[PDB]
Design a protein around this ligand. Structure first.
Ligand SMILES: Nc1nc2c(ncn2[C@@H]2O[C@H](COP(=O)(O)OP(=O)(O)OP(=O)(O)O)[C@@H](O)[C@H]2O)c(=O)[nH]1
Ligand SMILES: [Mg+2]
Length: 179
């Protein structure tokens, strides 16, 4: 069949890189703010090829009135945050959960931790440490997922592991195949 997946989350948390790596098997060479972009892809499940319609959105508040146009008929929504920026995890509870429940009631939500490669990146550890902070831990991610009612919590690194990215869509597809 066909599955519609929409990806939301704060600006620069890694939404576009995640989608580009999965659909185009290519990591973006530069950063360009996204408004809307649509990608097509297909995933095989138990001797079956499912067609995926993927929607990239803007993490910017300036597009709060535009973003909702992509929600209708969504099978699953991936809420992303940046493991290297704890503040982006707060947005999941403060903004994203409420927006999805408002426009996508009954849709399956998946909490996705992006840029896992930075959790052990020395420069990042040092910068965060100089301000009494640490990268988001797996446990913090998992607890947030339960708090907002997400089907599950999963992490990835579009930069270092293409497989971690494919796993996300593998799970997303399964969560929809059996609604
Ligand atoms: N270290 C690391 N950097 C990443 C990873 N993914 C994306 N980035 C970097 O993070 C920046 C923003 O990533 P994007 O994918 O464009 O972010 P976005 O969430 O789509 O941003 P908006 O369109 O503004 O909402 C870029 O400079 C990427 O190169 C990742 O897995 N690891
Ligand atoms: Mg983007």
């Amino acid at each position: 069949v066909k599955c519609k997946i929409v990806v939301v989350g704060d600006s620069q948390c890694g939404k576009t890189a995640l989608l580009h790596v999965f659909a185009k098997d290519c990591f973006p060479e530069n950063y360009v703010p996204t408004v809307f972009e649509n990608y097509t892809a297909s995933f095989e499940i138990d001797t079956q090829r499912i067609e995926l319609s993927l929607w990239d959105t803007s993490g910017s508040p300036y597009y709060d009135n535009v973003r909702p146009l992509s929600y209708p008929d969504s099978d699953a929504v991936l809420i992303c945050f940046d493991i290297s920026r704890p503040e982006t995890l707060d947005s999941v509870l403060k903004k994203w959960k409420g927006e999805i429940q408002e426009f996508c009631p009954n849709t399956k939500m998946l909490l996705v931790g992006c840029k896992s490669d930075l959790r052990t990146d020395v420069s990042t550890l040092v910068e965060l440490s100089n301000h009494r902070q640490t990268p988001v831990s797996y446990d913090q991610g998992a607890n947030m997922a339960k708090q907002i009612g997400a089907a599950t919590y999963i992490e990835c690194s579009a930069l270092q592991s293409e497989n971690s990215v494919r796993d996300i869509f593998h799970v997303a597809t399964l969560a929809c195949v059996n609604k």
